[PDB]
Design a protein around this ligand. Structure first.
Ligand SMILES: [Ca+2]
Ligand SMILES: [Ca+2]
Ligand SMILES: [Ca+2]
Ligand SMILES: [Ca+2]
Ligand SMILES: [Ca+2]
Ligand SMILES: [Ca+2]
Ligand SMILES: [Ca+2]
Ligand SMILES: [Ca+2]
Lengths: 659, 659
């Protein structure tokens, strides 16, 4: 119990509200007539009174005759365990006596109205709002941790509105409330608060753009939703009802954790006392709850697939047919839009709270040269949206440059949600780097602990050009897949030795035929050999940082043959389609068709890749996205992205490193 | 050891630097002629080589004949434990064989130069730079914690320069180096780095305004100081010397922890490899150290006094005489300046690192109406300076409004440095509050965990108007001292009852004589009674928050008689000098002379205060700062501030709550 100072008043009796969970220390000396010697006291049945002399306390009966010497160091401790009702007269009365005679010379009194006031949230994270969790004012990480969680309400309930639900101060439909965390103000007391008191809910100016709080009224003509705290509303005076009462509120987050915002917000209720005109009201009692806003979490390739989103031209038939075929071997749904934007402009992620969770799309920054407008078209009920706006964005801001590992353990530290991977350039290089605003956002989510890789040796500059992850069927394990030019050169040299040097690349692509590219022609190009040795140095630098930061050994890695060509900037583009960027649906892999040299009427790259993957139980389907274009220049014209189930592990059970 | 990828090259031999503390995994397959079957190897004495087949490793002799099948999954692991010298030929050579015959058909080789590179700091916090502390790249709090500490070098070595040492990129004198943390780059190797390598120290753009790093050269004409990292210098190419070498650097902090800056900074060294023209150099190896910049720490009244700074008019003689007398009972030095600025504009604090610490002044923000210019006049050798500049500052930005408690324990949580206290207004009041920039600064130091009190009921608005702390002599304990109007009224009512109602206030102040203020006149003023009842409510609200946030009981508190008068804003100013704002030099207290009612030719306020304090072993000296002015209007014309020894407890041994 918290101790509160309430003094009797020289002359006038004192009337005070007492909040359960506190107790009063009471000065009886200041109220005594000068020259009074001793005091006695009476009290009612529901008021417990102790006389405290220099720290030693003595319980006192309701009607006794006992007297004590008046001293500033002799005081009362006053405690009540139950709220007042209308039938209550709760009081303590003190009588004062002079030296001569046992009849009181004066009297001072304290008239009490006891009320219960508690602002309650689901701090124990079970989805139900418990009564006054002792830990509700704190937020701690881990399995044993406590404190309440809030979703950014970033989806859209109502289609005609252009923006996410949280962009305004209004609630249109009851469905919206299911995305919100419940907060209950529980009170117990008599019919009315005594004169001069009111109960007020409030938030800080700083948090006013992080939350909104709604109350549901049920007036005559239907249910309505009142915005009581949030943008440009810092406080709300609460209408008090007597007896045992509860007021239910619904709380939405407006903003994800970011640079300069930890994700923690607070809401308070105070009992205020009116003093006089032109004087602030005094906060007699204050109760506080904390919320943490849930982070955006990215889903790695190893999580179960739900939906496969695909963008291509209407007429790329082979691609559509083969992708349809692949998805039909799974339980996934196929969604087609008739152009890589679904892959480059969108990162699929999710948010979760004990009471609810939904997928959330992160939308890549607009440059204004290429992407003028944001992509909001996926925004819908229980499909959320978030974006960050930097200046000047480069290709490394594309989300082909954003990947996430499966759960890993590194030097004994666990990353149960995996770690986000972002391509970058060397510190002293003066090269390209993802914009600070996006990097800061990803870092602030904290639970995926991002790692920067080296992508800037590639023309386009995305990590998805050189690496991916696949699960190992029938196990809990996974593999890192790396592009390898050394594997490609070894394979082509073997085929040449075997008498296949005249085997031709790009068979069936009519726009490449005049080039007549053979194994011999590739192996005899000396400058191309040197370029690819250099690109292998770039791959191996990444291999090392991945082994270090993901805790991987060589046993966890498979190398897929790849080949690149250098541009004027000494950066790489694919010579033939990059097989590492593949659709991963559990055991079934859609792999870009390489169009490699035919040996015995089978592509030697396809056969080699099958020989690497199939023994592990992975099933390979090669998907041709380039035939419709008759040639391959290093560009990919289709994109896919897979929306997956969230991790079973709850993010709040993690313990991220101290910042 | 960290694993690094190095492949043999098809055709050409490979030459590489090997950094001790790493090891190489080596691809021998890519270098083999097509159609080669098996391989063998030789190696020199200081190179350890294992053949690894699918995870299983086998040690191999220097000159053996053993062969293994060529496979991509059969590789080498290469490890060196000692640096190369000039007499070293460190190498591994691989021979390739075809199916028919045991004579090698080709050979590939790896020529190695092993070097040691370590960037070392005193992470174990003993003041000496240990060799490669495994924890040097992290910073942890507490007794068991590790990682290196940096002072903001905010003092001034050289008087003609206007600003603090850290405001530039130059070091003028060797004395400055003693404020700096040492960082040693230790290397071991042969006479030169092999062609195409260089060693580079670097920092991030973000940290470039947080640190500077100097190197001392001893050329012909004297010692000089070179700025190698810091503002507008992000990297430095290191001149390599062979054998075992050390380069000593000195590091200074430029900035205190603040909003948006945790206090942590990093410095790196990398071994870079030259690839070609117009291509970035590759970071072959990188080593990192972290520093935490030491927080500004405020000294509470219970710490041993060193120097007493005093500001008054030349002619306030009684004050000077009495302050001189008081300080002469102690071992303290008295410093006088011939006006409260030393009290209002200055907060005495300190910084500490394992190798050094000094006092540091925090200078109150300039408004431009009253304080136009900063006070730098105390800036000197081992006396540092820091300030923050907000807009719009109010009286609550004055450091009379900044106090710090003695060490306390609250709900089982220890605050070994005490907690900073700042006066404020109620959240919904629209009242005054210390500027955000200063509040953010104090919060960011973290080790004093600030608490806001309610000062805005006072005209001036400072916590030093109503409260202070004193040690209890002969113990480890302390008392909170609170102004009390209830104590004053009780005392005056007793004196009136005793026949003293005609006793006069302000005796000897000629400018007050016409007012003829008596106990009777004070007690019969009904509006003044109501005002002071209200001010006691304000004091008691503070009493409650102090008991809660400092873990205090009523036994820890003494109430000194005080009286206030209300202004137009319903704010308080002292009716007679506030005794709570006192000079605390251990057992000896300089207490403002109250000029209370004389009873038997002694001030009844002085006698009462002595009766409260003297039994505890505290010695009271009443100090008259107002007689020189002939009257008291509520304003104080002198100021003092005491510079104290720092806490014995080291701040880095604390474990502050997670942010
Ligand atoms: Ca619950
Ligand atoms: Ca809304
Ligand atoms: Ca919603
Ligand atoms: Ca929803
Ligand atoms: Ca050391
Ligand atoms: Ca300097
Ligand atoms: Ca210095
Ligand atoms: Ca110095």
């Amino acid at each position: 119990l918290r101790e509160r100072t309430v003094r009797l008043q020289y002359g006038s009796r004192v009337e005070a509200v007492y909040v359960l969970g506190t107790y009063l220390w009471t000065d009886v000396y200041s109220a005594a007539p000068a020259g009074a010697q001793t005091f006695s006291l009476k009290h009612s049945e529901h008021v417990w009174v102790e006389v405290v002399r220099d720290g030693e306390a003595e319980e006192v009966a309701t009607n006794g005759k006992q007297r004590w010497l008046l001293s500033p160091s002799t005081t009362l401790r006053v405690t009540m365990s139950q709220a007042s009702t209308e039938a209550s007269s709760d009081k303590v009365t003190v009588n004062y006596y002079d030296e001569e005679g046992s009849i009181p010379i004066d009297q001072a009194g304290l008239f009490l109205t006891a009320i219960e006031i508690s602002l309650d949230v689901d701090a124990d994270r079970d989805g139900v709002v418990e009564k006054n969790n002792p830990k509700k004012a704190s937020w701690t990480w881990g399995p044993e941790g406590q404190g309440a969680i809030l979703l950014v309400n970033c989806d859209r309930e109502t289609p005609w509105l252009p923006k996410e639900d949280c962009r305004d101060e209004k609630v249109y439909s009851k469905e919206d409330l299911k995305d919100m965390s419940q907060m209950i103000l529980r009170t117990k007391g008599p019919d009315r608060l005594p004169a001069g008191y009111e109960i007020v809910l409030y938030i800080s100016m700083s948090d006013s753009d992080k939350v909104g709080v709604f109350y549901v009224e049920n007036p005559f003509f239907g249910q309505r939703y009142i915005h009581i705290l949030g943008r440009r509303k810092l406080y709300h005076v609460v209408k008090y009802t007597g007896g045992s009462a509860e007021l239910l509120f619904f709380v939405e987050g407006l903003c994800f954790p970011d640079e300069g915002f930890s994700g923690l917000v607070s809401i308070h209720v105070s009992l205020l006392e009116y003093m006089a005109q032109d004087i602030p009201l005094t906060p007699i009692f204050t109760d506080t709850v904390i919320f943490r806003i849930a982070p955006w979490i990215m889903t790695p390739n190893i999580l179960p697939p739900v939906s496969v989103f695909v963008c291509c031209m209407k007429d790329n038939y082979l691609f559509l047919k083969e992708v349809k075929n692949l998805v039909e071997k799974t339980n996934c749904e196929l969604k087609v839009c008739f152009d890589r934007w679904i892959q480059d402009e969108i990162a699929f992620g999710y948010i979760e709270a004990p009471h609810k969770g939904f997928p959330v799309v992160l939308d890549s920054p607009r440059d204004g040269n290429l992407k003028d407008f944001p992509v909001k078209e996926l925004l819908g009920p229980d499909f959320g949206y978030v974006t960050r706006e930097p200046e000047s964005v480069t290709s490394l801001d594309s989300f082909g440059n954003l990947e996430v590992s499966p759960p890993v353990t590194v030097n004994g530290k666990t990353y149960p949600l995996g770690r986000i991977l972002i391509g970058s350039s060397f510190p002293l290089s003066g090269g390209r780097r993802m914009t600070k605003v996006v990097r800061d956002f990803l870092k602030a989510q904290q639970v995926q602990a991002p790692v920067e890789l080296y992508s800037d040796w590639l023309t386009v500059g995305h990590v998805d050009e050189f690496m991916s992850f696949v699960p190992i069927p029938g196990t809990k394990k996974f593999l890192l897949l790396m592009a390898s030019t050394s594997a490609c050169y070894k394979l082509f040299r073997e085929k040449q030795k075997d008498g296949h040097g005249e085997a031709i690349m790009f068979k069936g692509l009519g726009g490449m035929s005049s080039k007549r590219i053979t194994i011999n022609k590739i192996l005899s190009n000396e400058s191309l050999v040197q370029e690819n040795l250099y690109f292998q140095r770039c791959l191996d630098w990444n291999r090392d940082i991945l082994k270090k930061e993901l805790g991987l050994t060589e046993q966890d890695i498979i190398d897929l043959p790849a080949l690149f060509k250098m541009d004027e900037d000494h950066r790489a583009r694919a010579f033939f389609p990059n097989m590492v960027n593949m659709i991963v649906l559990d055991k079934d892999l859609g792999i870009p068709k390489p169009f490699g040299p035919q040996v015995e009427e089978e592509c030697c790259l396809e056969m080699h890749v099958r020989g690497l993957l199939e023994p592990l139980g992975l099933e390979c389907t090669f998907i041709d996205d380039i035939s419709a274009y008759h040639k391959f220049l290093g560009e990919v014209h289709c994109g896919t992205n897979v929306r997956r189930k969230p991790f079973t592990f709850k993010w709040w059970h993690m313990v991220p490193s101290r910042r």
